[PDB]
Design a protein around this ligand. Structure first.
Ligand SMILES: [Zn+2]
Length: 252
DNA sequence: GGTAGACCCGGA
DNA sequence: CCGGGTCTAC
């Protein structure tokens, strides 16, 4: 899921788990667990804790328990569900948190690509994977001035800059391409070549792009089809080792 | 500071 | 053999 879908998951999942107490944690693919390094320690430590909250940072979910925070990334195919311990698990279920009321929070992932880390709540923000994560794109902490500062100092393309998780949290390939299109900026432009006007416009479109979705695509996956604004065929290239989609007329 | 390997596997 | 995102390794 992209950032807006992760926000919907956070909002939806919270009431289904808040106040519930963990009675067991079952792990069917231990490699998902990244901290503690031993999946047996991960499971042991969570037993007896109650779910108190659920927050999001970038595309990470942060489950707040009594003492610990569980930081979860679903990547593109991970999914959570709350369901009865009496019913058979869905295929590709890798981790299950069993609650004392006979319900479960289940993590499933055909790609087995997701990650979980657990630390004391107070340590979570300064440890991987949240350490160094940039500001929320919808926060005042993400500003044209913050963007301008990072752009001036780099040799990289503007696409590469926006894909850097330390610049802004949870902007992936799709919203990077879409934001650049809406701002009229070619993805392969060096970040340091953008004018002040271009940085301001890009910031505005990034916020609009994420903001509207959290509440139709112009270029992403649309190569060969006409631009929705000028009718020019959308093109696809490689920029910063990613599939990159753009209108060669609208973007400069 | 900036690139690359490592995770993962359904479908081309 | 490719795709994604985000960490660890050069
Ligand atoms: Zn166009």
């Amino acid at each position: 899921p992209e950032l807006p879908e992760v926000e919907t998951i956070r909002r939806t999942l919270l009431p289904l788990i808040v106040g519930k107490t963990i009675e067991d944690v079952r792990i069917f693919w231990p490699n998902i667990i990244r901290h503690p390094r031993d999946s047996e320690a991960f499971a042991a430590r969570m037993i007896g804790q109650t779910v108190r909250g659920l927050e999001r940072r970038g595309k990470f979910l942060k489950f707040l328990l009594d003492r610990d925070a569980l930081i979860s990334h679903l990547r593109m195919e991970g999914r959570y569900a709350v369901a009865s311990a009496l019913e058979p698990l869905e295929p590709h279920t890798h981790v299950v948190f069993c609650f004392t009321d006979g319900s479960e929070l289940r993590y499933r992932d055909v790609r087995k690509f997701g990650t979980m880390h657990v630390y004391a709540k107070e340590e979570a923000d300064r440890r991987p994977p949240l350490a160094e994560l940039g500001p929320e794109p919808l926060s005042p902490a993400f500003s044209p001035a913050v963007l301008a500062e990072r752009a001036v100092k780099t040799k990289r393309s503007v696409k590469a800059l926006l894909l850097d998780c330390t610049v802004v949290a949870g902007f992936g390939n799709i919203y990077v391409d879409e934001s650049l299109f809406r701002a009229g900026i070619l993805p392969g432009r060096p970040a340091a070549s953008l004018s002040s006007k271009e940085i301001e416009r890009l910031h505005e479109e990034m916020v609009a792009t994420i903001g509207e979705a959290v509440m139709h695509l112009y270029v992403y996956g649309r190569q060969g089809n006409p631009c929705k604004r000028c009718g020019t065929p959308i093109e696809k290239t490689v920029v910063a080792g990613r599939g990159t989609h753009y209108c060669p007329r609208c973007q400069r």
